[PDB]
Amino acid sequence: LAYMEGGALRSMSDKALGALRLAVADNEHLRDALRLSEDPKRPERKVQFFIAVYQHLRERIRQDIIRTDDPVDAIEQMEIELARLTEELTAREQKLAI
Amino acid sequence: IQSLTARAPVWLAAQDTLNQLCEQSGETLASSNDVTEYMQQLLEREREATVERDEVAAQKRELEKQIERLSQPSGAEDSRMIALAERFGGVLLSEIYDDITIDDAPYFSALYGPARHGIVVPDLSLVRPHLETLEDCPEDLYLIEGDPQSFDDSVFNAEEQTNAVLVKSSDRQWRYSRYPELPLFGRAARENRLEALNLERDALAERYATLSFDVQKIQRAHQAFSQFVGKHLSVAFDTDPEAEIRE
Amino acid sequence: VERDEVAAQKRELEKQIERLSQPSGAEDSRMIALAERFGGVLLSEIYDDITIDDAPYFSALYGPARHGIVVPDLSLVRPHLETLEDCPEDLYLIEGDPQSFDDSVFNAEEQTNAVLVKSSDRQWRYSRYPELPLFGRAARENRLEALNLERDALAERYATLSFDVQKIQRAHQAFSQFVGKHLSVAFDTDPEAEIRE
Amino acid sequence: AIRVTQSDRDLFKHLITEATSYVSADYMRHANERRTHLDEALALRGELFG
């Protein structure tokens, strides 16, 4: 992004915020943090919002089947699980009984 | 400077994707040829992991088939035998011996030999008309005559020996059966053995799960590298523009 | 992936053919040793040459007893019986002349594609006609050749797939070299016009 | 299982993307603003001193 003008950066930021408002509608902690983040004169608030998001995700990982703490890395493991489960779903068809 | 500036963002995006990709792997890439050789090593790991996966699958299939033979109703060649048991006024022999103890089970299994899973039918002439119709049955069907409710020991020319039994089946014919372990009859503890088999098959299921997961991981890694080269080589491994612009 | 698949199937066929150890189709040597230990001969060895047309009928007739020793005495076995431990778990023995083996005692009655045998008092045995009978083997070379035909078909398919993969890899190397040495100028316009200008 | 994992993956993949973009774009905009401020300071300093 270093080789872009500020107008494009603001456009992306605004559209991302538009998506976030809907994504985070139900939660309250994240909603409060996002609310606090939008004053341009206090930048660290945005990174604090980011930290809140990451922690919130880490609680929801369900490590019974997954081990990565970083969610971004956890995406690949969910993808692998989908592929493997779809493969197991194939067929057996040895059906014969009383 | 204008040329370098136009070129820079593409090179930077390419570098970020490359760093993510190689860091995701254990080995660090440095050139196009290097990436290709890494492709080849990835293929070799695919085709090894798949072989172990398939072999474990074969073992698991054998285990389920073995377990299934011991299931129902009195574990036998159940596919046709149950219908064949009711289509004549008879009872399955293995079912008559459902209750026998573990100590007499090997003896009886040796005694009855292949005929363990025959049917008891007290006349054997009433089947003679039905018989021509039997086109759907095990390749060797055994029939015995006696009272199904209080069946007497079939007249065998039997003779007990050390850990074995001798029998005269016919004039000029004898059979000699050695005591097996974990027999057919006594289908009370044969549930004990299928319990042992369930415990055995659990491990195969677990191991197969891990191997399949590994194969999928390798396949997706190859997909990632292919996607990369499809979208990336135009500027891969080129010299850093930040430096030259600074100069 | 496909050439590896075909290689695996060809291994399976080769394993199946190898399982035809001796002479063509494996026969248990332990039974030969047992036939040596008692005066007699292995039954399949007696009927190994019967016609393929009647072979399924005979195999249906004998059932499990197909693998057994023809001992005309039955006096040598009984003393040695308690000495037998390595033998197959269900050993079968028949009495008759090994050189000219008279029909075994079966009250056999022939049904449509099946046989019925009154084995003993209060016992009948019923069997259907199989294929690949133990008798009338004649080495069953035709099955060995059918398996060889299948194996050679798999080998040919494997050869074609290996050749195809080699072609593809060569094309890949060509492209790698090209983007290594001409990509910087690929698809650009002719400089002579600009030079003229 | 496929249903549950599908839902989890969709949620993660969308929320993480929006959070990351929203935060990082502003971070870079601040970096660029600082660079502009430094350039302005140096230019006006230079011509003032000369």
User: For A80, which of B78, B82, B213 is closest by C-beta distance?
Assistant: B213
| Residue C173, both tokens | 């190397």
Collapsing DSSP to helix, strand or coil, C46 comes out as helix
Cβ–Cβ under 8 Å, residues C143 and C55: no
| Residue C92, both tokens | 């079968």
Q: What secondary structure, in 3-state letters, does chain B show?
A: CHHHHHHHHHHHHHHHHHHHHHHHCCCCCCCHHHHHHHHHHHHHHHHHHHHHHHHHHHHHHHHHHHHHHCCCCCCCCHHHHHHHHHHCCCEEHHHHCCCCCCCCHHHHHHHHHHHHHCEECCCCCCHHHHHCCCCCCCCEEEEECCCCCCCCCCCCEEEEECCEEEEEEECCEEEEEECCCCCCCCCCCHHHHHHHHHHHHHHHHHHHHHHHHHHHHHHHHHHHHHHHHHHHHHHCCCCCHHHHHHC
- In 3D space, the residue among B206, B123, A31, B17 whose CA is nearest the CA of residue D19 turns out to be A31
Collapsing DSSP to helix, strand or coil, D30 comes out as helix
Q: Is B180 on the interface with C (CB under 8 A)?
A: yes
Collapsing DSSP to helix, strand or coil, C125 comes out as strand
Cβ–Cβ under 8 Å, residues B212 and A81: no
Cα separation of B49 and B47, whole Å?
A: 6
Cβ–Cβ under 8 Å, residues C126 and B84: no
Tell me if there are at least 3 CB pairs under 8 Å linking chains B and C.
Answer: yes
Q: Is B12 on the interface with A (CB under 8 A)?
A: yes
Residues in Cβ contact with B79 at an 8 Å cutoff, skipping those fewer than 6 apart:
A96
Long-range CB contacts (within 8 A, 24+) of B199-207: B200/B63, B201/B60, B201/B63, B201/B64, B201/B67, B204/B56, B204/B59, B204/B60, B204/B63, B205/B60, B207/B56
Residues in Cβ contact with B92 at an 8 Å cutoff, skipping those fewer than 6 apart:
B74, B76, B81, B82, B85, B117, B119, B120
Cα separation of C66 and B114, whole Å?
A: 13
- In 3D space, the residue among C22, C11, C24, C13 whose CA is nearest the CA of residue C142 turns out to be C24
Helix axes C2-18, B32-69, angle to 10 degrees: 40
Which residues, listed in sequence order, are joined to residue B144 by a DSSP beta bridge?
B120, C123
Question: Omega into C23 within 30° of 0, i.e. cis?
Answer: yes
**Tokens 């008891």 identify what position?**
B120
Test D23 with A12 for CB contact under 8 angstroms: no
- In 3D space, the residue among B94, B175, B165, B85 whose CA is nearest the CA of residue C64 turns out to be B175
* Binding-site positions of B for (R)-4'-phosphopantetheine: 246
User: For D16, which of A2, A17, A72 is closest by C-beta distance?
Assistant: A72
Q: Is C65 on the interface with B (CB under 8 A)?
A: yes
| Residue C14, both tokens | 């080769």
Cβ–Cβ under 8 Å, residues C56 and C89: no
Pairing relationship of beta strands B140-144 and B157-161 according to DSSP bridges: unpaired
Cα separation of C59 and C136, whole Å?
A: 9
Query: In what side-by-side order are the strands of the sheet with B119-120?
Result: B91-92, B119-120, B140-144, C123-128, C114-120, C108-111
What values do phi and psi take at B181, rounded to 5?
-110, 135
Collapsing DSSP to helix, strand or coil, D6 comes out as helix
Residues in Cβ contact with C114 at an 8 Å cutoff, skipping those fewer than 6 apart:
B134, C60, C126, C127, C128, C129
- In 3D space, the residue among C28, C44, C6, A61 whose CA is nearest the CA of residue D16 turns out to be A61
Q: C38: left (phi > 0), else alpha (psi -120 to 50), else beta? A: beta
Cα separation of C181 and C174, whole Å?
A: 11
Test A79 with D19 for CB contact under 8 angstroms: no
Burial zone of C131 (CB within 10 Å; 0-12 exposed, 13-18 middle, 19+ buried):
exposed
Positive or negative, the CA dihedral B213, B218, B219, B224 is positive
What values do phi and psi take at C111, rounded to 5?
-110, 175
Long-range CB contacts (within 8 A, 24+) of B83-86: B84/B119, B84/B134, B84/B137, B84/B141, B85/B119
User: For D26, which of A19, A46, A53 is closest by C-beta distance?
Assistant: A46
Experimental method: cryo-EM
Helix axes A71-88, A44-59, angle to 10 degrees: 30
Cβ–Cβ under 8 Å, residues B116 and B96: no
Chain B: give the shortest CA distance to residue C88, in Å: 8
For this entry, resolution in Å reads 4.3
Cα separation of C65 and C78, whole Å?
A: 19
| Residue C197, both tokens | 């200008």
* One-letter identity of residue B212: S
Cα separation of B57 and A90, whole Å?
A: 14
Q: Is B214 on the interface with A (CB under 8 A)?
A: no
Interface of C with B in 107-126 (CB under 8 A): 111-114, 116, 119-126
Collapsing DSSP to helix, strand or coil, C5 comes out as helix
Cα separation of D36 and D34, whole Å?
A: 5
Residues in Cβ contact with C76 at an 8 Å cutoff, skipping those fewer than 6 apart:
C38, C39
Cβ–Cβ under 8 Å, residues B103 and B196: no
* Binding-site positions of D for (R)-4'-phosphopantetheine: 42, 46
Q: Is D6 on the interface with A (CB under 8 A)?
A: yes
Half-sphere CA count of B152, side-chain side, radius 13 A: 6
Cβ–Cβ under 8 Å, residues B208 and B56: yes
Cβ–Cβ under 8 Å, residues D32 and A2: yes
Closest chain A residue to D18 measured between Cα atoms? Answer: A16
Tell me if there are at least 3 CB pairs under 8 Å linking chains A and C.
Answer: no
Cβ–Cβ under 8 Å, residues C106 and C117: yes
Q: For residue B90, give Cα distances in angstroms to A98, B156, D15, D16, D32.
A: 18, 20, 69, 70, 93
Cα separation of C48 and B172, whole Å?
A: 21
Which residues, listed in sequence order, are joined to residue B175 by a DSSP beta bridge?
B167, C92
Test B220 with A83 for CB contact under 8 angstroms: yes
**Tokens 């001969």 identify what position?**
C41
For chain A, the chains sharing at least 3 beta-carbon pairs closer than 8 angstroms are: B, D
| Residue A59, both tokens | 């609680």
Cβ–Cβ under 8 Å, residues C145 and C71: no
Chain B: give the shortest CA distance to residue C60, in Å: 8
Q: Is B10 on the interface with A (CB under 8 A)?
A: no
Closest chain B residue to C110 measured between Cα atoms? Answer: B132
Helix, strand, coil % over all residues of chain A, rounded to 5: 60, 0, 40
Closest chain B residue to C64 measured between Cα atoms? Answer: B114
Test A19 with D18 for CB contact under 8 angstroms: yes
Positive or negative, the CA dihedral A66, A67, A69, A71 is negative
Closest chain A residue to B217 measured between Cα atoms? Answer: A80
Chain B residues close to A84, C-beta within 8 Å = 209, 212-213, 216
Positive or negative, the CA dihedral B80, B82, B88, B90 is positive
Closest chain A residue to D14 measured between Cα atoms? Answer: A23
Residues in Cβ contact with C158 at an 8 Å cutoff, skipping those fewer than 6 apart:
C3, C6, C7, C10
Cβ–Cβ under 8 Å, residues A10 and A40: no
Cβ–Cβ under 8 Å, residues B119 and B85: yes
Cα separation of A63 and A88, whole Å?
A: 22
Q: For residue B229, give Cα distances in angstroms to B225, C130, D32.
A: 6, 58, 32
Tell me if there are at least 3 CB pairs under 8 Å linking chains D and A.
Answer: yes
Chain A: give the shortest CA distance to residue D4, in Å: 10
* One-letter identity of residue C79: P
Which residues, listed in sequence order, are joined to residue C123 by a DSSP beta bridge?
B144, C120
Chain A: give the shortest CA distance to residue D49, in Å: 30
Q: How many helical (H) and strand (E) elements, i.e. helices and strands, does chain A have?
A: 4, 0
Cα separation of B169 and C92, whole Å?
A: 10
| Residue B51, both tokens | 């072989």
What values do phi and psi take at B183, rounded to 5?
-80, -170
User: For D1, which of A60, A79, A85 is closest by C-beta distance?
Assistant: A85
Q: For residue B165, give Cα distances in angstroms to B179, C40, C176, D42.
A: 8, 22, 75, 108
